[PDB]
Design a binder for this molecule. Sequence first.
Ligand SMILES: [Mg+2]
Lengths: 76, 76
Amino acid sequence: MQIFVKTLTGKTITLEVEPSDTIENVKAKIQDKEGIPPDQQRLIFAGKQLEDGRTLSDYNIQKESTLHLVLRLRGG
Amino acid sequence: MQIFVKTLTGKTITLEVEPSDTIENVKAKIQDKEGIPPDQQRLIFAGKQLEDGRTLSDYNIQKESTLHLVLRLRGG
Ligand SMILES: [Mg+2]
């Protein structure tokens, strides 16, 4: 299924995922498409900062959902 | 000046800081007192995930302010 990722500059990424993908898998796919290290990615959805070991289905991320991606150089 | 840090278990940390301290300095002080690596710390205040290179004064963190600390193993 297709999901989207929006960035702070207004850009949209499209990803091919499954509900059983983990957030780790999703960040890895963003690295595959756009070269961003997973450790620099914060994915945010429905008011929650997403955890790498949980799945898309855990967060009710569905076909056509849009995640918010914020990049970071250090933790915070 | 004195600020406080609240955790998800309900515990309170007390820190001695200055408005010109960076968030990096604050996380380093939490490591000094409690041994938590800065890379595992997320400090959250007034609806903002705080950035390591900004100062307490940038976020209007004041005497008696309480930050929210959420620990993470991987970026998320
Ligand atoms: Mg130290």
